[PDB]
Amino acid sequence: HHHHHHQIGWRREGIKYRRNELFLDVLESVNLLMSPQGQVLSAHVSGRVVMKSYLSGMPECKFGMNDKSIAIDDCTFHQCVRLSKFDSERSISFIPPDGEFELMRYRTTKDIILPFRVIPLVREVGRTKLEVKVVIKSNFKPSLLAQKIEVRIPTPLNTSGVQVICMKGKAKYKASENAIVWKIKRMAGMKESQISAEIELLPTNDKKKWARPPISMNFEVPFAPSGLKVRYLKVFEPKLNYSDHDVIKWVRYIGRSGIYETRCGADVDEEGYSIKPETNHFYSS
């Protein structure tokens, strides 16, 4: 009974790391079309899990998710994942490639945590004025902070001048872009902010009702709008004898805005050790 030799094409043998560790990045884009009254007309999240594996040997990994939450409509796995166990047990088990790879990508349309509601109100005062007020609510944990928030409010062509007021961030009228651009650096959850706009209009000869573009928003969020949460990443190397109890896990959720709209009334060193790449923690290089 001679035994076969196991050669995996995506991971060589003899990977040695001074410090066993791994990175998990849950990257997601949330998309939205919301009515002016707050009705979700469309919404979806595309996401993927990027793993950087700086582990030694041939480690056996089991990635655990908060799904028996996140409702997954369809997902494609990297070849390393054992498709048999995900069929029956819903387990994600693999010996990962060395370095960075995409463990899975997925799509979500249900139970989506929309990080921002935009409540718009545009009032008409004759053909020479247009009074705009826009509120944004952050509907996540107060513990968390959103970055790079930008709100785009469309202005009609015949805008002759705007005076804008806000108490958060900055708001500049960009006539070439036909928009008021409202940039906020940071904002916590369960909060509100508001912008005020008095827009002056030159009346035209049409009296054709202005067909509004939607109000769009850009932002980053430190969680997954799909609701996905990393429960565990168990590791076991049988030959070197180490488990995830001996490993450092670095986990990060980056939630991005995709099209988020709301209508407004319309490698090895000398000794055989692999070197990590480079780019404030007690254990980071």
Numbering used by the authors: 152 to 219, 240 to 437, 477 to 489, 497 to 502
Question: Could you share sentences copied from the article?
Answer:
Proper operation of the pivotal CME cargo adaptor AP2 requires membrane-localized Fer/Cip4 homology domain-only proteins (FCHO). The AP2 complex, composed of α, β2, μ2, and σ2 subunits, is pivotal to mammalian CCV formation, and its deletion is embryonically lethal in mice. FCHO1 and FCHO2 are similar in overall domain arrangement —folded N-terminal acidic phospholipid-binding homodimerization F-BAR domains and C-terminal folded μ-homology domains (μHD) separated by a ~300-residue, low-complexity intrinsically disordered protein linker, which has been suggested to participate in AP2 activation, although how it does so is undetermined. We dissect the network of interactions between the FCHO interdomain linker and AP2, which concentrates, orients, tethers, and partially destabilizes closed AP2 at the plasma membrane.
To confirm the identity of the extra, Cμ2-proximal electron density as the N terminus of FCHO2 linker, chimeras of Cμ2 alone with N1+N2 attached to the C terminus via 30-residue unstructured synthetic glycine-, serine-, and alanine-rich flexible linkers were then created, crystallized, and their structures solved at resolutions varying from 2.0 to 2.6 Å by MR using an unliganded version of Cμ2 as a search model. The Y pocket is variously filled by parts of the tags of an adjacent Cμ2 molecule. Muniscin family conserved side chains make key interactions with Cμ2 residues 167 to 170, which form the BR3 PtdIns(4,5)P2-binding site. The N1 interaction occurs mainly via complementary charged interactions between Asp318, Glu320, and Glu321 and the Cμ2 BR3 PtdIns(4,5)P2-binding site containing Lys167, Tyr168, and Arg169. Isothermal titration calorimetry (ITC) measurements showed the binding of FCHO2-N1+N2 to have a KD of ~25 μM. Mutation of key binding residues in Cμ2 (E320A+E321A+K326A) reduced binding fivefold, and mutating Tyr323 to serine rendered it unmeasurably weak. The FCHO linker does not directly interact with the Y or Ø cargo motif binding pockets in any structure but does pass close by before its main chain changes direction at FCHO2 Pro327. The weak density that follows on from N1 adopts a range of conformations forming crystal packing contacts, which we believe to be nonphysiological (mutations FCHO2 Y340S and E336A+F339S have little effect on N1-N2 binding). Whereas N1+N2 binds Cμ2 with a KD of around 25 μM, N1 alone (i.e., deletion of N2) reduces binding by ~5-fold, demonstrating that N2 plays a role in binding AP2. In support of this, mutating four of BR4’s basic residues to alanines (BR4-) caused substantial reduction in binding of GST·FCHO2 linker to Cμ2: The lower level of binding reduction of Serinc3 loop results from binding Cμ2 only at BR4 and not to BR3 (43), whereas in FCHO2, N1 can still bind to BR3 even when the BR4:N2 interaction is disrupted.
